[PDB]
Amino acid sequence: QILPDPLKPTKRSFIEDLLFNKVTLADAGFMKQYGECLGDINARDLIC
């Protein structure tokens, strides 16, 4: 449970997956395109 499992696609361990699931982030890509911001205006995105 504390070491990565070769079978699963993830490179993390099970407990690490749980930990990463327990914290919510606004965005993870660090990439927001001008076309994306201009075209989803109705959303009023904080990052935009």
Next chain:
Amino acid sequence: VVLSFELLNAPATVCGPKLSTDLIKNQCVNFNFNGLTGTGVLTPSSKR
């Protein structure tokens, strides 16, 4: 004679002598709407 009015906050039907042009969209332009001037890109909106 005393003239009173309001500016750049509501509909207007009195204007100075100026020539209107066509509408350009999806392009960075200088714009002037009823006297409010600026620079930006104009797109169609879903707001009512």
